[PDB]
Coordinates of C-alpha atoms in Angstrom, one line a residue:
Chain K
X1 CA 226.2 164.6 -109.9
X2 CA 223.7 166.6 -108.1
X3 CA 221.5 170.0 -109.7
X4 CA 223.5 172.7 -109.2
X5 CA 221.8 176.5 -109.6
X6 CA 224.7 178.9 -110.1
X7 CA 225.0 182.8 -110.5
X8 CA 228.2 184.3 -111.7
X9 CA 228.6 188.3 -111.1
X10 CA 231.6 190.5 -113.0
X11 CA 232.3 193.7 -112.3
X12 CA 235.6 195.8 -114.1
X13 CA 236.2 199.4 -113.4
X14 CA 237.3 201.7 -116.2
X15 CA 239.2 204.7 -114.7
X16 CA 238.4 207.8 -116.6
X17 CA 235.3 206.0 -118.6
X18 CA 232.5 206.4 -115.8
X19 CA 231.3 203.8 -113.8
X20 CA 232.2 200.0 -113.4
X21 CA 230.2 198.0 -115.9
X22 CA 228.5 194.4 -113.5
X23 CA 227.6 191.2 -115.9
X24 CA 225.5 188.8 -113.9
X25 CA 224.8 185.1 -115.8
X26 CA 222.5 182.3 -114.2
X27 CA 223.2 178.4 -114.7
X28 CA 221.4 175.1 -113.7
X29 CA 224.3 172.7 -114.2
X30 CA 225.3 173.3 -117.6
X31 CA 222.5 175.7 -119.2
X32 CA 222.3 179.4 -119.0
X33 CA 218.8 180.4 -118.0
X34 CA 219.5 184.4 -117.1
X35 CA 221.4 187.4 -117.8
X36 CA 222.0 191.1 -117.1
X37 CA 224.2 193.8 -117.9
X38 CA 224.6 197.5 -116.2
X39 CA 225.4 198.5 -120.2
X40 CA 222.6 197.7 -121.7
X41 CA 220.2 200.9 -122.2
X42 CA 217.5 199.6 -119.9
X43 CA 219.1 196.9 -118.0
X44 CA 217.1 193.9 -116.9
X45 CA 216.9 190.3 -116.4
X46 CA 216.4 188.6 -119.6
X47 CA 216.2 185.0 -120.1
X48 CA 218.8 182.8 -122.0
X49 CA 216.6 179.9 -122.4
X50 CA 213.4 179.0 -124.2
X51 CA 212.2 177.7 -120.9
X52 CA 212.4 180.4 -119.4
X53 CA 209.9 182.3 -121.8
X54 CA 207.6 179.6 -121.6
X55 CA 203.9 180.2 -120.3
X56 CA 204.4 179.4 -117.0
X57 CA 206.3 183.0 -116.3
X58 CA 203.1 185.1 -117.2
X59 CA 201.0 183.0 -116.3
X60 CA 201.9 182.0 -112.6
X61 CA 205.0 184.5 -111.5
X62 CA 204.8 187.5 -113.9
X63 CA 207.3 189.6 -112.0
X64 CA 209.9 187.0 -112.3
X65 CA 212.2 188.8 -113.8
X66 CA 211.2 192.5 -111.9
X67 CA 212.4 191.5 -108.9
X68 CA 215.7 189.8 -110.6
X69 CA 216.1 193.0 -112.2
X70 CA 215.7 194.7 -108.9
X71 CA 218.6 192.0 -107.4
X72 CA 220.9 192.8 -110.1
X73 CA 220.9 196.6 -109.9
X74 CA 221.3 196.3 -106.4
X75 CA 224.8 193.8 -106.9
X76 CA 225.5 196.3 -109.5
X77 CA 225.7 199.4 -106.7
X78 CA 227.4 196.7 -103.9
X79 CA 230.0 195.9 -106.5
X80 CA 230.8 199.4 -107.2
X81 CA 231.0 199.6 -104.1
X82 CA 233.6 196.6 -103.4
X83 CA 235.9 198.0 -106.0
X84 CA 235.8 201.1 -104.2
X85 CA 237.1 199.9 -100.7
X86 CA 239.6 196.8 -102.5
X87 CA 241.5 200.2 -104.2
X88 CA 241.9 201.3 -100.3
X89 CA 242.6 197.5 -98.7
X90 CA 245.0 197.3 -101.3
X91 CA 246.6 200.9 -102.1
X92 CA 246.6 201.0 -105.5
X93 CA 246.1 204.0 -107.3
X94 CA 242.1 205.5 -109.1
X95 CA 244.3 204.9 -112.9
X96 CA 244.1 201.2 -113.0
X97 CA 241.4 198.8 -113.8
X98 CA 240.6 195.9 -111.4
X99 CA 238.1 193.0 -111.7
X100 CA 236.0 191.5 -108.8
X101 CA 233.7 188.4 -109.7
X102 CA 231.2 186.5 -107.1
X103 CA 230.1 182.6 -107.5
X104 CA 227.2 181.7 -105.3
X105 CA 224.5 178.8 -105.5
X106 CA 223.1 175.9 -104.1
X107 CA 223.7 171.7 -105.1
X108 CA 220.5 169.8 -104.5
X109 CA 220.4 166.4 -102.4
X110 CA 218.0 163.4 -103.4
X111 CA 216.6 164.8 -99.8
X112 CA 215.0 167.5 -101.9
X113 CA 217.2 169.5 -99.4
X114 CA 220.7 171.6 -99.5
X115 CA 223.7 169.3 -100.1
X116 CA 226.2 172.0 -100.5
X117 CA 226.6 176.4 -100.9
X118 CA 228.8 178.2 -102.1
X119 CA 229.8 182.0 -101.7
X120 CA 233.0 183.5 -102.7
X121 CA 234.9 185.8 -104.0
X122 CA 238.3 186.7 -106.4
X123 CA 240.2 190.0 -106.9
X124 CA 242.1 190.7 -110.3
X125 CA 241.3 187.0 -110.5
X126 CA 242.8 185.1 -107.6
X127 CA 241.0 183.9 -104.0
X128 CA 239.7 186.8 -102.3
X129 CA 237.4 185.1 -99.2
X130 CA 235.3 182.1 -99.5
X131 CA 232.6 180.5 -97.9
X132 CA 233.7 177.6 -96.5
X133 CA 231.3 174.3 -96.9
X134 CA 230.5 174.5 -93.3
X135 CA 228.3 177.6 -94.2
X136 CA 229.9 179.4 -90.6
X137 CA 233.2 180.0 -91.3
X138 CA 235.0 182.2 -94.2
X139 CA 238.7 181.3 -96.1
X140 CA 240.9 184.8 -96.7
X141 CA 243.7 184.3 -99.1
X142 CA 245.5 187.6 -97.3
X143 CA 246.1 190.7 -94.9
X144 CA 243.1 191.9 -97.0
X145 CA 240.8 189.7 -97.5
X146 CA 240.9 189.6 -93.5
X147 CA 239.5 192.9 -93.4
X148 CA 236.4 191.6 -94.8
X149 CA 236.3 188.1 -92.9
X150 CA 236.4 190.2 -89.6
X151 CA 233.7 193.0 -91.2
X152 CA 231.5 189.7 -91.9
X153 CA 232.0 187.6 -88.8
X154 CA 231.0 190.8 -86.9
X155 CA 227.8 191.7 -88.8
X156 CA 227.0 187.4 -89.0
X157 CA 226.3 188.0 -93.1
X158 CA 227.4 183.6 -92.8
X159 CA 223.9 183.2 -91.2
X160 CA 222.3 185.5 -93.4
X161 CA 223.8 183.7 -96.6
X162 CA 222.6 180.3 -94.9
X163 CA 218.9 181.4 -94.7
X164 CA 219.5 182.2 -99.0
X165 CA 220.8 178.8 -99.1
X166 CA 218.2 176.6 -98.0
X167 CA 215.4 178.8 -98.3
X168 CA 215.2 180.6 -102.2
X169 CA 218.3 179.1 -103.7
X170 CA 216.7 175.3 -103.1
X171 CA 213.1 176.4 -104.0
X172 CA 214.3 178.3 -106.8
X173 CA 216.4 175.5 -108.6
X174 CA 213.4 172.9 -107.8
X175 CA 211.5 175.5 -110.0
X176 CA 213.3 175.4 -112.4
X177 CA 214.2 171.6 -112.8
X178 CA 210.8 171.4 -112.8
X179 CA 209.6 174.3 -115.6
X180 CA 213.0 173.1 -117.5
X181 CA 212.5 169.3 -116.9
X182 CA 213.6 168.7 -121.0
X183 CA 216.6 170.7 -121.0
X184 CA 218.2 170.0 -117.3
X185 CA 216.8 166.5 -116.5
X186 CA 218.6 164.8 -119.2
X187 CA 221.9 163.2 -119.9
X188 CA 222.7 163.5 -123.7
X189 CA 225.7 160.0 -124.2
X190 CA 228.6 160.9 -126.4
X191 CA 228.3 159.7 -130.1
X192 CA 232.1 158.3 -130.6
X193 CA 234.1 157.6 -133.4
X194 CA 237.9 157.7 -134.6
X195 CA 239.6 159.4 -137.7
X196 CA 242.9 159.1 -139.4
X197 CA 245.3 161.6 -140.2
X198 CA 248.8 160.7 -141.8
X199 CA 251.6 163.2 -140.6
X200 CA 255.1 161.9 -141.8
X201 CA 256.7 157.8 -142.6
X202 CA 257.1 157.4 -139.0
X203 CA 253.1 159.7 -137.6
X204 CA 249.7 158.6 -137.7
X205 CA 247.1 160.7 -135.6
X206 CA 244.1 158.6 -134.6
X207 CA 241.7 161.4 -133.0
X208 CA 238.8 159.7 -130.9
X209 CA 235.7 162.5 -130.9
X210 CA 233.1 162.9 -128.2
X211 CA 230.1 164.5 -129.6
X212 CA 226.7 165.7 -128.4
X213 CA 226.6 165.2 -125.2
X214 CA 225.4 166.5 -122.1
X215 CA 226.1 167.5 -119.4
X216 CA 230.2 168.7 -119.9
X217 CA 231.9 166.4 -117.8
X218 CA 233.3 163.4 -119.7
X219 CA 236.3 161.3 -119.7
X220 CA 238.0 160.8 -123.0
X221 CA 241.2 158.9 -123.1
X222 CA 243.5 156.5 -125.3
X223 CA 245.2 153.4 -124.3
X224 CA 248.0 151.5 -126.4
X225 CA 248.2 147.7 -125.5
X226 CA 245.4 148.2 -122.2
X227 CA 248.4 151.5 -120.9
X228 CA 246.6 154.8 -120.3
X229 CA 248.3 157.2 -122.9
X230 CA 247.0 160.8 -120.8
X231 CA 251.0 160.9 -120.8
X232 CA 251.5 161.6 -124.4
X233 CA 248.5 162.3 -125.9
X234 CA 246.8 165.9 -127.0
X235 CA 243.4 166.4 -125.4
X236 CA 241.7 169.6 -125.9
X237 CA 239.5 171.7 -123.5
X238 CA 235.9 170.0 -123.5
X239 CA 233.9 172.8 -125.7
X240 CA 230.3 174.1 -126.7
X241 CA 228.9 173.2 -130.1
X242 CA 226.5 176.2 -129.6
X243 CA 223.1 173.7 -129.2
X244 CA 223.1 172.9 -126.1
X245 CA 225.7 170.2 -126.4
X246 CA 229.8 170.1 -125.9
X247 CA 232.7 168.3 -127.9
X248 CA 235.8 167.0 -126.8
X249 CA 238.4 165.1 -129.0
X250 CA 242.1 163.2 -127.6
X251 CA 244.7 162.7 -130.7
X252 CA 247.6 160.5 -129.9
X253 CA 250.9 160.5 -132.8
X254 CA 251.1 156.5 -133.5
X255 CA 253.8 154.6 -135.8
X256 CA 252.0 153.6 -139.1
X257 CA 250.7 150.0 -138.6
X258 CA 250.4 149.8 -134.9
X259 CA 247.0 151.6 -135.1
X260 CA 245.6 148.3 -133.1
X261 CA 247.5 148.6 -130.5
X262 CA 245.1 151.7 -129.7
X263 CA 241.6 151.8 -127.8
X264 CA 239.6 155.0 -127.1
X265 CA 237.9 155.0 -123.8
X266 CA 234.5 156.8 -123.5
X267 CA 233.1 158.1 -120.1
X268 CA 229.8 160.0 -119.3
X269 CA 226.9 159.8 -117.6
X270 CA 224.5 159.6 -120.3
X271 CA 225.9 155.8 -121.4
X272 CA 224.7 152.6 -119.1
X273 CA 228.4 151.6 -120.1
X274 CA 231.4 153.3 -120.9
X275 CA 232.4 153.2 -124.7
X276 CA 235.5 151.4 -126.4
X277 CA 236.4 151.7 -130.0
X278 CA 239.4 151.6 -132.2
X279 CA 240.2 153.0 -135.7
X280 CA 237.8 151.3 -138.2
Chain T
X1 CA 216.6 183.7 -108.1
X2 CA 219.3 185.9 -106.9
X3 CA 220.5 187.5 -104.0
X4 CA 223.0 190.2 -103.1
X5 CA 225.5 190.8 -99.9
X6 CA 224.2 192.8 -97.3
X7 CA 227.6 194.4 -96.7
X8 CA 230.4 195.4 -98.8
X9 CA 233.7 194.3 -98.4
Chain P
X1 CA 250.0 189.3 -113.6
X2 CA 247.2 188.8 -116.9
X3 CA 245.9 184.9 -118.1
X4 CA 246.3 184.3 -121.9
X5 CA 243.5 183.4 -123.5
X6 CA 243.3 179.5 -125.6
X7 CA 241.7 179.7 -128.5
X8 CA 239.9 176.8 -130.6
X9 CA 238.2 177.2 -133.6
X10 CA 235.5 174.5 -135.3
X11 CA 232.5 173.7 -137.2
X12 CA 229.7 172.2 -134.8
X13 CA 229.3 169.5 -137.5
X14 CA 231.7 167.8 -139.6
X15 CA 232.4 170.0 -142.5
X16 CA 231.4 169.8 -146.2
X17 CA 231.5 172.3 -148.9
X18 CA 228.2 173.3 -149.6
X19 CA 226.5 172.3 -146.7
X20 CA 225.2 174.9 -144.0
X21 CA 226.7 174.4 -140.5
X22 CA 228.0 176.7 -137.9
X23 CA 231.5 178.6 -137.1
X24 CA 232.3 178.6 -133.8
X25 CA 235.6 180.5 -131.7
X26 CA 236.1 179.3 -128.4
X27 CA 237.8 181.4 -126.3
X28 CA 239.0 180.5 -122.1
X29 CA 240.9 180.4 -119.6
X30 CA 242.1 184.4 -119.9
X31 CA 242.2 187.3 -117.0
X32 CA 241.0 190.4 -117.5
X33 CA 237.8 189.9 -119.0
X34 CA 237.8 192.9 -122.0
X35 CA 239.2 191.2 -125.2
X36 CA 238.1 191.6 -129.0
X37 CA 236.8 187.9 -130.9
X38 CA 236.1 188.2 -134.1
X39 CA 235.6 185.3 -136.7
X40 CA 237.3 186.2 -140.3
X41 CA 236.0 185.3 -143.6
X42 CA 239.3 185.5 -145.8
X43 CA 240.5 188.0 -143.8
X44 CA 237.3 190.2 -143.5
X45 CA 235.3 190.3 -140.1
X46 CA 232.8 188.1 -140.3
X47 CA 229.0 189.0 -138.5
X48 CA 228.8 187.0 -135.4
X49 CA 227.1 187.1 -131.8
X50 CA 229.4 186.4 -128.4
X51 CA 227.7 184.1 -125.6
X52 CA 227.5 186.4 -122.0
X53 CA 230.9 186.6 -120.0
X54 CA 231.1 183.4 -117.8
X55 CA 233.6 181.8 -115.6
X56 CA 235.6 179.0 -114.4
X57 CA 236.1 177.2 -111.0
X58 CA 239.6 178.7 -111.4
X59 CA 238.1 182.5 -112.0
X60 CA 239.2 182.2 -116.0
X61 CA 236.5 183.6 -118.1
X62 CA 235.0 181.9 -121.4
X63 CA 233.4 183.5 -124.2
X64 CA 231.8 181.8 -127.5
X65 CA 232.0 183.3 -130.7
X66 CA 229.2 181.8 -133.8
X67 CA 227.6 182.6 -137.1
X68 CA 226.4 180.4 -139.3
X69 CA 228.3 179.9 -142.2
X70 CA 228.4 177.6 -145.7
X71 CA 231.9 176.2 -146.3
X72 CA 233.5 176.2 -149.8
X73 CA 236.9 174.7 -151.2
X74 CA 237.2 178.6 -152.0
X75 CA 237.0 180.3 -148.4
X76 CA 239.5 180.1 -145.5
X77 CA 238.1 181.2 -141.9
X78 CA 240.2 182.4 -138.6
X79 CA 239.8 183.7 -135.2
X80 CA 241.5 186.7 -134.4
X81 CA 241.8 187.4 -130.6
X82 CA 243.7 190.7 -129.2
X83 CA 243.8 190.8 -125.4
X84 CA 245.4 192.6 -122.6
X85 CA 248.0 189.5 -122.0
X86 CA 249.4 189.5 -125.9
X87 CA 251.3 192.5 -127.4
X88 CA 249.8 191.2 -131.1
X89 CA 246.4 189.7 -132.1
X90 CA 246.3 185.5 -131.6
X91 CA 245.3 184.1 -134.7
X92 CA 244.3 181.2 -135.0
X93 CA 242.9 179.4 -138.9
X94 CA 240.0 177.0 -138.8
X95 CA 241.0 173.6 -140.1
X96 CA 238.1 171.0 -140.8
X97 CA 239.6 169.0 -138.7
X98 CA 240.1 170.0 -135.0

């Protein structure tokens, strides 16, 4: 796929227990690089990867993370603010908590240029307005949501967003592509294999593993006589292993003896070819 | 690097 | 109108008694994001660190909880999640093999 730089912003009020508390996190594709957090005693931007305490930071931009810092507080204040005015748009009573989270960023074309942005918005978790790809026009899930569309079309914040988009958000993941070339320009392949695992006279499980790859997206899958198996099998949620890498495993329940009748198929973009392999 | 919303909701 | 969370519990390598590895709880696809993760050594709360709050194309939120740890034929491990959505705590053992 493309580089993708990603912030993700959280803010939860806590009626009677002072002001909303605003967690902002910074990806490139699958690697946390920044973080901050209203709670902390003195909150900045810190990093969350090594290179982003590399020499390069002091060395060429030493108040990189300043002027995050300076960002975040300010999100912090407009979030306490959106909160605030949602309460009204939505007449629910001071007593009740509510959540309001933000997903912005740029994907990078071979053009060195702006493929796609992104902007937008849930309430208590669901749609709240979007950016649409367009980069002019905004999506409202409801009466709500409206309210704002109208506030935004009026004030041209689209345009605004735009000038973000393919000015700092670009430069900003070229940057760091760049400064984390090791980490982010890299495709770790899966390492596959199959175990065993009786279960009754009439239960086998044959679970095919993905490990150590990078970046998350995968396709794992079983087929019995050359039949895609998605249908019966379990496949779990694709996971961290806490290094940099994710895990993924698909079981399927076979009769004892017809354990060659099953293939596990392998897909990532780490391997020239896809992978398939069978119990021993 | 970041940005924030000139206007609220 | 809250998401429950799904829970999986693992070693980042394949187990062996004796060996040191890690003990991760992974924790996603739940709304609100306040909830209590805590990784148990025989019962006991084990000490751990939690990744920063992230989210999903779907607005779910993930967390990661880790130590290191040494298994032993001796010493079970869990995950114990409470959360907003459950009226009990979700727990959840580690098996070696999931």
């Amino acid at each position: 796929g493309p580089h993708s730089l990603r912030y993700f912003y959280t803010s939860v009020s806590r009626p009677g227990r002072g002001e909303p508390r605003f967690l902002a996190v910074g990806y490139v594709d699958d690697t946390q690089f920044v973080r901050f957090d209203s709670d902390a005693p003195n909150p900045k931007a810190e990093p969350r990867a090594p290179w982003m305490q590399q020499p390069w930071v002091e060395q060429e931009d030493p108040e990189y993370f300043h002027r995050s810092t300076r960002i975040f507080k300010g999100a912090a204040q407009i979030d306490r603010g959106n909160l605030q005015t949602l309460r009204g748009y939505y007449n629910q009573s001071e007593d009740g908590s509510h959540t309001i989270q933000r997903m912005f960023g740029c994907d990078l074309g071979p053009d060195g240029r702006l493929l796609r942005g992104y902007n937008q918005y849930a309430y208590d978790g669901a749609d709240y307005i979007a950016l649409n790809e367009d980069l002019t026009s905004w999506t409202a899930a409801d009466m709500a949501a409206q309210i704002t569309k109208r506030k935004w079309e009026a004030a041209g914040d689209a345009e605004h967003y735009r000038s973000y988009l393919e000015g700092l958000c670009v430069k900003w993941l070229q940057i760091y592509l760049d400064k984390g070339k090791e980490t982010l320009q890299r495709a770790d392949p899966p390492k596959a294999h199959v175990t065993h695992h009786p279960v009754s006279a009439r239960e086998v499980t044959l679970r095919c593993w993905a490990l150590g790859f990078y970046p998350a997206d995968i396709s794992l899958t079983w087929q019995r006589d050359g039949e895609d198996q998605t249908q019966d099998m379990e496949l779990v949620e694709t996971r961290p292993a806490g290094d940099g890498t994710f895990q993924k495993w698909a079981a399927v329940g076979v009769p004892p003896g017809e354990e060659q009748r099953y293939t596990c198929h392998v897909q990532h973009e780490g391997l020239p070819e896809p992978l398939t392999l069978k119990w021993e | 690097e970041p940005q924030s919303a000139p206007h609220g909701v | 109108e809250p998401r429950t969370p799904k829970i999986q519990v693992y070693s980042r390598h394949p187990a062996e008694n004796g060996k040191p590895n890690y003990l991760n709880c992974y924790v996603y696809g739940f709304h609100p994001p306040q909830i209590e993760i805590d990784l148990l050594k025989n019962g006991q709360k084990m000490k751990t660190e939690q990744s920063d709050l992230s989210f999903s194309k779907d607005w779910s939120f993930y967390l990661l909880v880790h130590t290191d740890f040494t298994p032993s034929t001796v010493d079970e491990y869990s995950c114990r999640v409470n959360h907003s959505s459950l009226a009990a705590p979700h727990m959840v053992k580690w098996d070696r093999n999931n």
